[PDB]
Amino acid sequence: PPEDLMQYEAMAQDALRGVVKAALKKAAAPGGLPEPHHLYITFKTKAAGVSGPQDLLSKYPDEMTIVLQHQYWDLAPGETFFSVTLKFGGQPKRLSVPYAALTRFYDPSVQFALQFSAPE
C-alpha cells in the first residue's frame, strides 16, 4: 500500500510534458533558442497522432530521437502537438508529434533532462 486513487504521479508526468511544449515555443520564437541551448526530443513512432514519411517511420519501429539545434525549419508548436521540418540524408521531411508521444527530453547545455510515459 497505499493505492493512489488520485494518480498523483501520473498527473505530475502530464504536468511535466508541458515543459517540453513551453520549451518548443521559445524555440519557435523568431531567432530560435538562446544559444548554446538545443533540444533532444525522443518519442514513440507508433503512438497515435504522429505522422511522417512512411519510409522514415518504418526505419524507426518504436523510438525515435530528433535534435533541434542546427537543422530544423518551421517549428510549429500547437497546443496538443508540434510539427517540424528536419533533414534525413540531406532530404527535408515533415513530422508531427503529440506531446503525449514524448518519452524523453534533454538539453545538453545545462544537462536538464525529463523522462515520461514511464510509471516505473
Partner: peptide, 10 residues
C-alpha cells in the same frame, strides 16, 4: 542521445 535527423553545424 542518438538523433535520427542531420545535425552538422554550418
Amino acid at each position: 542521445h542518438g538523433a535520427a535527423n542531420d545535425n552538422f553545424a554550418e
